Design a protein around this ligand. Sequence first.
Ligand SMILES: [Br-]
Ligand SMILES: [Hg+2]
Length: 208
Amino acid sequence: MKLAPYILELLTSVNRTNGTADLLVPLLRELAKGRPVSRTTLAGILDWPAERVAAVLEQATSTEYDKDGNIIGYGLTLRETSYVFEIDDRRLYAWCALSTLIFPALIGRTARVSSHCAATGAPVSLTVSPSEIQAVEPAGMAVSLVLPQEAADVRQSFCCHVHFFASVPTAEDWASKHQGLEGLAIVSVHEAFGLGQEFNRHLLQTMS
Ligand SMILES: [Br-]
Ligand SMILES: [Hg+2]
């Protein structure tokens, strides 16, 4: 299918203000270590004042913090979700299906991803590298997409509708009982991975 409007609206969304793109990649690489990330640690990596770092993060309303005020969730998260995302010996989680497909290229590591079909509850898993996916089980795995909304919180308007399914038929059956959700579409995990690749290329083509 035609992916340009998905890529465009997703890109538009992360350019909240200048900073997000350039903050996003180091933050993900820190979260991938499996521990909470301090605002000062980010500042060291970015060479920004911590208050600039906070100014970027305050625009991102779904950012998760722990009891110590450290960052534990931003696309990748230490707080349990349906999308398990393991790097090395650390279990991490992700906000949605497409996240799991995108973030391995950004952090430069292969991830072991596992979830459950949102229609049937069947387990699903794959290995996601910066350049390819492997071990897709079951092989006909599918992904739901919706159109992101620009000024909406990305987690509540996009991530919460973007799931893994055991198969395209299963997913399409499920989709026929959702309506009004703008841009709802079912694709194979391969097409979603390709989507994530175009997204990343565009997003990286515009950092410092
Ligand atoms: Br188009
Ligand atoms: Hg997402």
